[PDB]
Design a protein around this ligand. Structure first.
Ligand SMILES: CC[C@H](/C=C(/C)[C@@H]1C[C@@H](OC)C[C@H](O)C(C)(C)[C@@]2(O)O[C@@H](C[C@@H](OC)[C@H](O)C(=O)O1)C[C@@H](OC)[C@H]2O)CO
Ligand SMILES: Nc1nc2c(ncn2[C@@H]2O[C@H](COP(=O)(O)OP(=O)(O)OP(=O)(O)O)[C@@H](O)[C@H]2O)c(=O)[nH]1
Ligand SMILES: Nc1nc2c(ncn2[C@@H]2O[C@H](COP(=O)(O)OP(=O)(O)OP(=O)(O)O)[C@@H](O)[C@H]2O)c(=O)[nH]1
Ligand SMILES: Nc1nc2c(ncn2[C@@H]2O[C@H](COP(=O)(O)OP(=O)(O)O)[C@@H](O)[C@H]2O)c(=O)[nH]1
Ligand SMILES: Nc1nc2c(ncn2[C@@H]2O[C@H](COP(=O)(O)OP(=O)(O)O)[C@@H](O)[C@H]2O)c(=O)[nH]1
Ligand SMILES: [Mg+2]
Ligand SMILES: [Mg+2]
Lengths: 426, 424, 424, 426
């Protein structure tokens, strides 16, 4: 029961996915050759949530790896845990996507998507009771954004009563990584508003801030950033894979975190994150962890949470702890600072607890916030997009693939509507 | 002989049930491998098997039970499982997913009934607020009502606290449960987690608690309630008596459950722990196991269940003293507002536990207009939420209708009015 | 039976209380782990537990008690704690910080009362001058008055000395206490540290004392006062009798407390230690336990509490002799100015102590116009301080008002006038 | 209960603070790595007053270290006990303060102060019942004086019902250490008059006198002077950390030592202070200790106490002693020399006693005097300031940071008012 199918699309999506599979593997005591070397029966009890068993006690992640160019996936295969994946689950094209949503969604991606869908169907048929799908991609490129969105559309059409959740890497206000980012992001976001149940919004600038300000890390690698993201990802599904006092679930989280269907864009966080120098200096108390969790500096989106209000927040705690303490802390936060929580939803904080903590920690926590502050990201994207579109700058690359102006206007309209909705509850 | 069947539904309920079963085993000397009739059905190999129904839509808690210490004790059926939980959604319990499992549960219940020569009725453990414990439990109760009718249907329910919670669709679910268990359940006994925490802070002198402790506390209360069926004593109370004594009107049937003395080893020696003192403690505002002041409400009917060393004279004296106090307000229409139950068997201490051994302990079940305030608060919360149509798409998207909510609200209002009337 | 409850408030009070409890234990053979009814409430395991209230706003003294030798003796509640002390501030005791704890204290007192079948009343230990002992104690006393009314409220108070002190806001606090315990406390027994030191220098031949010794001395006096409740003897005095015999007018209720023989081992053998001699010593100016000359004042009423070997004839003779002396001045309106109490039980020696074993000892409680002078001195001090409005911002900054001080002064003046009138 | 938060600001403030933390650490049996190696349970009972406990029985001082330049704090970290501090509690800027109060208070310091306040808030949130704050700084420089004052202002605004006490190193009449000292001192003192509950006035010349005349020390180091100051500091809070016969407290001392709100400038002293040569020659009696305490030569301010009157004095005794003896000694001093004690406050001396004596001594004492003689210091400062200001000498350095003449005049006015007040009781 409760099988989850993973899809990783494009460069960033595949890279983050590799790290995620490493982390999950280590959590379950699975080595790169698919052999189990754990010490606890809890490690295998719910291994089926992420893994499929093969002859000779081999475990193979239910992961589908998708790209329009072979490089990234060749690197992944060459990598440490790369040999753990099913070879038949690498689905790739030959021509690149040129950071072009239209190529991912309408042309190059359209040619490949049926093949991906077939693999997806095959995997879903092996599920006793499939919970849903997890997707990893970027919003600013062509493959993860265009192809990824397309895949989501297809799967929701075919499996409309399953959970569809994405970890989506978004552009950052200071330092864009591509010139057409606003166009791609807007085109993706338009589709995600209507075709996903929840989306975790990750901002690389926030990750860098975490690495520098919090972790005191002089020289963060993308690998290190990926690790953090993977940790957050693992947190979300912990309650499917292990016992607890309050057993959470994806669906439960959705129920408690989405008060209106379109408002499903979350700011993720993780705790504790402490510098290697200052480890003995910190006392690892639930209160202190809570404080870390709620600190804007420990968020992974391009928002100031203090510039908005929390509609709902879900906290998932890992390790041994007093439920009394947890509840009291939650009460204290809300009573003290009631202005930062929407007044029309009493008890804005939901708590879940899983007994088994991650490696190397006695306690940890994962934070998921639905804040009206997220509107700032959307507003900024919209401004950027309009700045370009009003001059039809770069547009020939998209019209050449058959897109029309009207689609862009529709996207803009959707964006603005979303922003307006967010402003309502602000 | 006197026989009753337990039903444990959800996560919370199942947790409570584990504790209860442990307590029972400790009481009757049964080993974890099964090596009494009231709770344990006996088979032809010197083996004792619980007479319970264990239900969960998520296969996790049940799985834990199946792997843990008391796995050989339970039957491989009594422990029932599903595939996906309701996820704090009354609609997925009552309408969508519950009607897949309910039949099986009913069958099991019937089987259990068949194995008894005098079924006193049912004890059900669920939670107002949880997805399964709200809807599924309600569904089950309705079915039971349809089937048996005049078999006792007692409920043990975890009421949501006012100033603390663990789920932001908890008002809706609870309201729905209230709506659909108002014409079925005869008694719904109440415990609140915040209250328990407060008690721990105050009396036990412990401020690092966990769910296990709470469960154990609940189990103690349960044992006290059920001690008259399993041991001798003056004034042997029955499951059928509670209904008679604590339900003045059929809609009004939520009484609070409190236990004394809840005290650690250090100040067990300092205290005398006489009967009168214990009785006094039982009626004290802070010692109550919910978040309500009984100073803001009149006691309709109270039931006291003394367990251990008790001279009935002393109990009588205590009751008289209580009556004398100005606060302790009773209603105009209920002068005789006390029921008294006594057992020779003392309480039983659970190894690695919170509580020490005592000579005598008391469990009080009280039906009062203090809960009206709580109900009102809940209603207000619901109103605040439902005004914007928040979360409604989840419930409506699996069976429910816009209008049902309104009906529920109306029902709640009616209940409040009734309470007000009673107060006069 | 005859039962009384002790209350110990502050640092000083708590210290005194420790000594007292030690003395009690020594008297009744109770071990430090609890292995009589008058003071020790008995429980169902051959364990004896003090019947006291221990209160401090600073958690230090109480903590010491909790860790020390007699930790198992005391209950984990009787010893009550706060977070921050008043810091020589009546206002932080009576108004600001005291109204956080007072309720708990009251509850405890009520509980203790409930455990008694004939509560004679209260013995309270505090200090005029200290922050907690001034304001908090006053507050407590008022509450007690409101509650019980006709239960004895005896106080043991450390009066500030004239030529020595340990705090430069001591006049204010004391004055405030006097103002707000003039219409509540029935008796306020007085001891002064300077006087005790003088006694040590003179009679004991010891000139390197400490607080512990003083506390022990105080405890002896306390024991003498309370010996009639716990042992047999001719003329068994009660806590209720003191009020009757030492309070001619309700405002006038501060009597001095003195003890004889306070003497070391060396000149215990030299002295005869007859009854008459002891009596004489009791009335000697230097032997008194405050800084006042009773030659400058008329004795209204005196109470003598002989403990040990005493032929009542001898006592009578001694009293007659005392009467004969020109301191020794008595008032015109009180001819019979003596109350006599006798116990067969002798005094009890505390290991590592100042005092040796004696056949017979005497405790004298005397209400006299000599304390008027002291009061006047205190008033003068207050006037000197308050004329410049020194320290007033501290008191006013936590509750008090300019005007209250004036009222207090007026009250003091009235008291002085009353004393003067009595003198005539 | 009764947690104290320490703030150390600027060069002198950090240096004195280092020594203080060493001394307190040794008193509590805490080694530089935060491990406890004591012999008595009394050592840990109230350790929470100064220390916070972390994983692995680690103790971390509740200390905030502040400077506008990194040098001094780098030295502190390099030092013996430097590794005991929480790394996150070092808050520093990059540009120096140039012995300029305006830079500390209005410009450079203004940029840093919010960061400090955040740390302060974090520490105060960890207190079950925070008693108050202790600050260490100099009055004559830029950082300790300007920045330090600023911090005090902020904290009093936020925590107006807590105790705010400072150990403030002041300029000395003979040998000034900077040219603008009068300006800086006056500017600081103005703020301290209104924003602190008590200030211990330390004069380096007095310390040198102590070292040479009393201790017979040919070659005192700043380290040695710092030690003495630390000893005095420890004395003040002894009754929070240990049992006693008369348990004092900061608040209690304030109550007994401040008869009018603005007169809260104390002259500290310590006893015994005896030369290593003449140790066996002295009999360590309470009387002799008392005599030392009341000797002008054993004071740490730039005053002749005989040129004024004591408004109140607080004596805190440490070790075993007869309360009888102590009281008698106090009486004798006042009776014999009633002219040196203000006549309108009977019993000008308050005594406290703590059972546990400092290392290497059977008895010790700390003296705190509120004497009208302190006016001389203020008067001398005022004279100096006016000498400069009437010629607007050095003033452009301050006006350039936005200060106006009117502020200086206000400061002067305050000073003069204070002096007048002191003269009243003289
Ligand atoms: C409750 C939701 C929440 C809103 C607030 C304001 C919360 C509340 C508190 O945390 C729980 C603040 C907290 O108690 C502290 C003061 C210890 C502290 O962490 O505050 C921050 C700054 C603060 O924002 C000002 C922070 O960024 C933040 O998010 O604060 C500096 C930091 O330096 C170490 C420290 O001083 C947003 O999710
Ligand atoms: N006292 C106690 N309360 C519990 C326990 N487990 C859960 N709860 C409470 O029950 C409520 C949540 O309902 P659960 O029983 O966890 O939910 P469920 O019935 O499993 O329903 P879904 O998970 O929604 O399908 C919250 O108020 C919890 O605090 C427990 O073991 N003891
Ligand atoms: N005889 C005696 N006197 C004491 C003792 N302790 C304190 N005192 C005296 O009591 C007065 C001080 O009051 P304390 O009781 O210490 O003060 P407190 O009640 O704790 O109040 P704050 O400390 O101000 O909150 C002084 O006159 C002391 O000499 C003691 O153990 N024995
Ligand atoms: N966090 C993270 N971001 C990445 C990684 N690789 C690429 N990106 C980001 O993803 C965006 C570029 O999209 P990318 O996935 O490389 O393009 P695609 O292959 O067309 O989908 C930029 O915002 C990059 O900063 C990665 O490994 N980790
Ligand atoms: N007692 C003592 N005084 C110091 C120390 N360091 C500097 N000073 C004095 O502090 C004053 C100079 O201020 P300083 O703290 O160095 O300047 P800042 O860094 O701008 O605050 C002078 O009076 C110095 O004599 C020290 O370690 N101990
Ligand atoms: Mg469940
Ligand atoms: Mg005290």
């Amino acid at each position: 029961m409760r099988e989850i199918v993973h899809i990783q699309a494009g460069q960033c999506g595949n890279q983050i996915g590799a790290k995620f599979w490493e982390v999950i593997s280590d959590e379950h005591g699975i080595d790169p050759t698919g052999s189990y070397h754990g010490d606890s029966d809890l490690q295998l009890e719910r291994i089926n949530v992420y893994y499929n068993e093969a002859a000779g006690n081999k475990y193979v992640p239910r992961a589908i790896l998708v790209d329009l160019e072979p490089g990234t996936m060749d690197s992944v295969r060459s990598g440490p845990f790369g040999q753990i994946f099913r070879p038949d689950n690498f689905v790739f094209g030959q021509s690149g996507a040129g950071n072009n949503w239209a190529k991912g969604h309408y042309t190059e991606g359209a040619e490949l998507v049926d093949s991906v869908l077939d693999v997806v169907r095959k995997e879903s048929e092996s599920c006793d009771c499939l919970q849903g799908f997890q997707l990893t991609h970027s919003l600013g490129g062509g493959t993860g954004s265009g192809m990824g969105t397309l895949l989501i559309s297809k799967i929701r059409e075919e499996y409309p009563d399953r959970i569809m959740n994405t970890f989506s890497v978004v552009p950052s206000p200071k330092v864009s990584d591509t010139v057409v980012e606003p166009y791609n992001a807007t085109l993706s976001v338009h589709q995600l508003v209507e075709n996903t149940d929840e989306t975790y919004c990750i901002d690389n600038e926030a990750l860098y801030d975490i690495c520098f300000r919090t972790l005191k890390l002089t020289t963060p690698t993308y690998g290190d950033l990926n690790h953090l993201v993977s940790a957050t990802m693992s947190g979300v599904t912990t309650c499917l894979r292990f016992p607890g006092q309050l057993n959470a679930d994806l669906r439960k989280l959705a129920v408690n975190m989405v008060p209106f269907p379109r408002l499903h864009f979350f700011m993720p966080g993780f705790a504790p994150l402490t510098s290697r120098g200052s480890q003995q200096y910190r006392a690892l108390t639930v209160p202190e962890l809570t404080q870390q969790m709620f600190d804007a500096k420990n968020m992974m989106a391009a928002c100031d949470p203090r510039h908005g209000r929390y509609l709902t927040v879900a906290a998932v705690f890992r390790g041994r702890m007093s439920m009394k303490e947890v509840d009291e802390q939650m009460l204290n936060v809300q009573n003290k600072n009631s202005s930062y929580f929407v007044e029309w939803i009493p008890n804005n904080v939901k708590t879940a607890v899983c007994d088994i903590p991650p490696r190397g920690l006695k306690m940890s926590a994962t934070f998921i916030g639905n804040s009206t502050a997220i509107q700032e990201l959307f507003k900024r994207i919209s401004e950027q997009f309009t700045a370009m579109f009003r001059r039809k700058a770069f547009l020939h690359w998209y019209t050449g693939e058959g897109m029309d102006e009207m689609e862009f206007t529709e996207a803009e309209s959707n964006m603005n509507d979303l922003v307006s909705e967010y402003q309502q509850y602000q | 002989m006197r026989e009753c069947i337990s039903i444990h539904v959800g996560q919370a309920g199942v947790q409570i049930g584990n504790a209860c079963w442990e307590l029972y085993c400790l009481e009757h000397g049964i080993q974890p491998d099964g090596q009494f009739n009231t709770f344990f059905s006996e088979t032809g190999a010197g083996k004792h098997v619980p007479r319970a129904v264990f239900v969960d839509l998520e296969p996790t808690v049940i799985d834990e039970v199946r792997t843990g210490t008391y796995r050989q004790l339970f039957h491989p059926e009594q422990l029932i499982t599903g595939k996906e939980d309701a996820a704090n959604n009354y609609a997925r319990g009552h309408y969508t997913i519950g009607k897949e499992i309910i039949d099986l549960v009913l069958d099991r219940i019937r089987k259990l009934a068949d194995q008894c020569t005098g079924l006193q009725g049912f004890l059900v453990f669920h939670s107002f607020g949880g997805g399964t414990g709200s809807g599924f439990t309600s569904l089950l109760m309705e079915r039971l009502s349809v089937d048996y009718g005049k078999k006792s249907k007692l409920e043990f329910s975890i009421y949501p606290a006012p100033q603390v919670s663990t789920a932001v669709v908890e008002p809706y679910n609870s309201i729905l449960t209230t709506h659909t268990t108002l014409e079925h359940s005869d008694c719904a006994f109440m415990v609140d987690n915040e209250a328990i925490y407060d008690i721990c802070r105050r009396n036990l002198d412990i401020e690092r608690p966990t769910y296990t402790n709470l469960n154990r506390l609940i189990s103690q209360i349960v044992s006290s309630i059920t001690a008259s069926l399993r041991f001798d004593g003056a004034l042997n109370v029955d499951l059928t008596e509670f209904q008679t004594n604590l339900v003045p009107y059929p809609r009004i049937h939520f009484p609070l459950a409190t236990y004394a003395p809840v005290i650690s080893a250090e100040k067990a020696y300092h205290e005398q722990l006489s009967v009168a003192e214990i009785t006094n403690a039982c009626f004290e505002p802070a010692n109550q196991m919910v978040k309500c002041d009984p100073r803001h409400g009149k006691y309709m009917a109270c039931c006291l269940l003394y367990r251990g060393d008790v001279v009935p004279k002393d109990v009588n004296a205590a009751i008289a003293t209580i009556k004398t106090k100005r606060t302790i307000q009773f209603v105009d229409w209920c002068p005789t507002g006390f029921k008294v139950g006594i057992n020779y068997q003392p309480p039983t201490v659970v190894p690695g536990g919170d509580l020490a051994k005592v000579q005598r302990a008391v469990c009080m079940l009280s039906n009062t207009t203090a809960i009206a305030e709580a109900w009102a608060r809940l209603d207000h919360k619901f109103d605040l939420m439902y005004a914007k149509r928040a979360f409604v798409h989840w419930y409506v998207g699996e069976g429910m209708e816009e209008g049902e909510f309104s009906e529920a609200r109306e029902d709640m209002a009616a209940l409040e009015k009734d309470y007000e009337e009673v107060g006069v």
